[PDB]
């Protein structure tokens, strides 16, 4: 996203653009596409070298003014103390890869665990293609009764995980029982 | 360093003392200095002590370094094991390293040493020098597929 002066520091995107975007997403009028955002200067393409010369906010809620009551169980995010902004991140959950986007709450585990799961999820049995019955590959393994998880990362919607899931919601009990 | 010392009563007590740690090492000149106790100095480099304080002191410094790296993890291994390793590294004049340079170039048979490094050049030089292997070592009697001189085969068995 692009932050500029309107008034004061504010991102260039706005709720009307989201209106037109999701209204195009429903027709599924002059459709509002990703290219319509890019060719409108509401979004830029920053590579590794370029981000050395800009100051990026992480969430748009970093752009409200600040001047109490709070959930102590909520996480402790620091006041950002920065106002020379130029951009705001899209969403930090998008720094992840394709395989680390399946784990729920990856912000609550030890990073080695998440890497181990990243490497193991490529092993799981499931439906790899709806046309397994036509393709005669050398090794095919399909799960009889796949299920979509009850805990979903939002990014599954674009990874089609809830359309081709590869696991089951086992009823887990964490118990000591007969020592097997 | 709160060193333990006996009181005149016989009861041990911790006597605190001031100690100096260095960021460099040069033994030859530091101990030959007034004001210090040249009987208690210690260097974390054993290879300088081997040159300065004879060979047995280097042996002991090496053993202490090994015990330190084992005690770092809280582990404990028994003195006979590290002692065998150390006194092997010291059963020659100086520190016989455990690399291809060191013990490896010994005359410990010929089919023994052809199983660590320079696997071919060792056979070459042993055909050249016309080495004779005792074939008493483990690896020789293993390569021969014979019963090796091990605990079970340290002897012979005859009839009455």
């Amino acid at each position: 996203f692009i932050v500029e002066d309107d008034g004061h520091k504010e991102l260039k995107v706005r709720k009307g653009h989201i209106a037109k975007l999701m209204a195009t997403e429903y027709q599924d009028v002059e459709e509002y596409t990703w290219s319509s955002l890019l060719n409108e200067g509401l979004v830029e393409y920053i590579d590794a070298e370029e981000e050395e010369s800009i100051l990026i906010a992480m969430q748009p809620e970093d752009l409200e003014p600040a001047e109490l009551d709070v959930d102590p169980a909520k996480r402790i995010r620091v006041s950002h103390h920065a106002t020379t902004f130029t951009h705001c991140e899209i969403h930090p959950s998008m720094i992840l890869g394709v395989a680390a986007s399946i784990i729920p709450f990856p912000d609550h585990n030890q990073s080695p665990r998440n890497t181990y799961q990243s490497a193991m999820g490529k092993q799981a049995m499931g439906v790899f293609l709806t046309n397994y019955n036509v393709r005669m590959d050398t090794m095919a393994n399909i799960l009889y009764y796949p299920q979509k998880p009850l805990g979903t990362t939002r990014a599954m919607e674009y990874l089609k995980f809830r359309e081709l899931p590869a696991g089951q919601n086992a009823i887990v009990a964490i118990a000591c029982y007969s020592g097997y | 360093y709160d060193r333990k010392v006996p009181s005149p009563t016989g009861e041990y007590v911790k006597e605190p003392e001031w100690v100096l740690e260095t960021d460099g090492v040069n033994l030859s000149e530091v101990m030959t200095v007034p004001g210090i106790d040249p009987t208690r100095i210690y260097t974390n480099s054993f290879i300088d002590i081997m040159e300065v304080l004879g060979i047995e002191a280097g042996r002991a410094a090496l053993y202490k370094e090994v015990y330190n790296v084992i005690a770092s993890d809280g582990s404990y291994v028994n003195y006979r094991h590290m002692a065998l390793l150390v006194d092997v590294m010291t059963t020659q004049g100086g520190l016989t390293s455990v690399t291809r340079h060191g013990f490896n170039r010994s005359n410990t048979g010929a089919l023994m040493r052809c199983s660590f490094e320079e696997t071919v050049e060792i056979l070459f030089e042993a055909g050249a020098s016309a080495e004779l292997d005792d074939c008493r070592g483990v690896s020789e009697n293993v390569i021969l597929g014979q019963m090796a001189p091990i605990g079970t085969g340290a002897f012979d068995v005859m009839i009455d």
């Binding site: 720094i95 992840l96 395989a99 990243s118 490497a119 | -």
Partner: protein, 43 residues
């Protein structure tokens, strides 16, 4: 399949560990273990 389609390789001075520049362009978690850990990254 989707991971394999987005997979990199580095041939071979500390090129393995994660770097501040990897933010947003490479997964910090997704990478093989043991041999060539950190060489093969997934964007």
């Amino acid at each position: 399949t989707l991971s394999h389609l987005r997979r990199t390789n580095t041939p071979i001075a500390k090129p393995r560990q994660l770097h501040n520049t990897h933010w947003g362009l490479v997964c910090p978690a997704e990478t093989p273990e043991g041999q060539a850990c950190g060489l093969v990254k997934n964007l």
